[PDB]
């Protein structure tokens, strides 16, 4: 699984 | 900018982790900055990325890399050795057209070898470099500083990234040492994938993979063993334990020789797969765009072109390329809640001395 969060 | 975490598992990699952070534009420089790291049972890797996609007006990109890598060979089912390395890469990217892109680059790498278990092929390379460590001790060391030119070509006309049904992908990477380097060698790698739909709905597809590797020394040196090719495992020849295909270590005695079943890879490799993609039985059509079944026939060989079967006639000729392993089995891919997933069951119906088997293989991906 890969979590991605645009800061 | 953005940041990301990743957990994965693989039969060959164990539990794996990944993270990274990227600034889309770094203070108006026009170059994106990035820090990325990963870790699994046998590798710890970290890098600093610095790239700009428009170095020229018409698309040419410029990329920088700065990395550290720690590798445990025994954890990767190879004969024991430890390689701690770091280096930098400068790479130019040229899009030739819609389906082709080229890249050229200059690289520096420092390799620090330690904890090497004495064996014939490994020591043979060490002898070619002028290094002659004890053959009864595992407390050794060898360090090199190398500079490389790196070529690259990628063709991609795949109809789709997730679960392709039509088109091909080819990736060719080469590199050669620049004079002044401690090592002297070239190394070439070729990967191909071809998807042929045999039905109008594109549910029934034929997939042909090939993977090739060849490298050898220049000036009487050999290619460093830590640049070897391997075969066997979830991603090459299924049903075979990871990296088991090819030569095995011939160990020197400890404080005459001993044949082993510990793979060491080789400087030449060939892998091919014929895979038949079908609809998934025992699953609804609701879940078709998220699952893929397939039936496959895998084959591959790895050999050591510098193996001297004269000096070591009592053991198998590890320079022989024709001992071609084969397996057949079934595979299942699923875009799961836990991410990309792959089961596979395969029987190695053509194996050889020392080849370790692994019928059931499993992988959860951490990058998507
Ligand atoms: C070893 C790689 C470094 C990965 C950095 C992860 C970034 C996590 O930062 C989260 C920031 O939240 C805001
Ligand atoms: C990543 C940049 C690499 C720069 C390549 C320059 C050419 C290498 O010269 C090596 C000199 O070594 C002296 C021994
Ligand atoms: C582009 C940066 C290249 C870094 C050059 C490092 C030089 C390594 O040689 C070490 C020699 O010391 C012995
Ligand atoms: C872009 C510069 C790369 C130069 C290649 C060096 C080839 C070394 O050959 C050694 C022959 O001996
Ligand atoms: C409309 C029915 C789809 C036809 C099934 C295709 C079978 C092809 O694979 C057999 C080899
Ligand atoms: C929801 C309907 C599911 C349809 C299942 C079709 C399964 C077809 O598998 C054929 C496998 O044959 C491969 C040859 O070995």
Numbering used by the authors:
A (entry chain B): 1 to 7
B (entry chain A): 424 to 678, 698 to 810
Quoted from the paper:
Recently, darobactin A, a novel bicyclic heptapeptide that selectively kills Gram-negative bacteria by targeting the outer membrane protein BamA, was discovered. Concerning their mode of action, the DARs bind to the promising target BamA, which is located in the OM of Gram-negative bacteria and not yet employed for any antibiotics in application. With the recent cocrystallization of BamA and DAR A, it was clearly shown that the inhibition of BamA’s function relies on the interaction of the peptidic backbone with the β-barrel domain.
Among those, the sequence predicted to encode DAR B (W1-N2-W3-T4-K5-R6-F7) particularly caught our attention, since it was a precursor peptide gene that was present in addition to a DAR A-encoding gene within multiple Photorhabdus strains. A similar mode of action could be expected for DAR B, based upon the similar activity data even against DAR A-resistant E. coli strains. To confirm that both compounds compete for the same binding site, we used solution NMR spectroscopy and X-ray crystallography experiments. The high-resolution crystal structure of DAR B, resolved at 2.4 Å, revealed that DAR B binds to the same binding site in E. coli BamA as was identified for DAR A. Thereby, the amino acid side chains of residues T4 and R6 in DAR B are pointed toward the barrel lumen. Furthermore, the binding behavior was also compared in aqueous solution by NMR experiments. The 2D [15N, 1H] transverse relaxation-optimized spectroscopy (TROSY)-HSQC NMR spectra of the transmembrane β-barrel domain of BamA bound to either DAR A or DAR B superimposed essentially perfectly, indicating that the two ligands bind in identical fashion and cause the same structural rearrangements of BamA. Notably, the amino acid composition of the binding site on strand 1 is not conserved between E. coli and A. baumannii, which is in agreement with the backbone-dominated interaction mode and the variability of side chains 4 and 6 between DAR A and B. E. coli strains with an altered bamA sequence showed resistance to both derivatives. DAR B shares a similar spectrum of activity with DAR A, with a 2-fold increase in activity against A. baumannii, which was observed across multiple strains in both wild-type and clinical isolates.
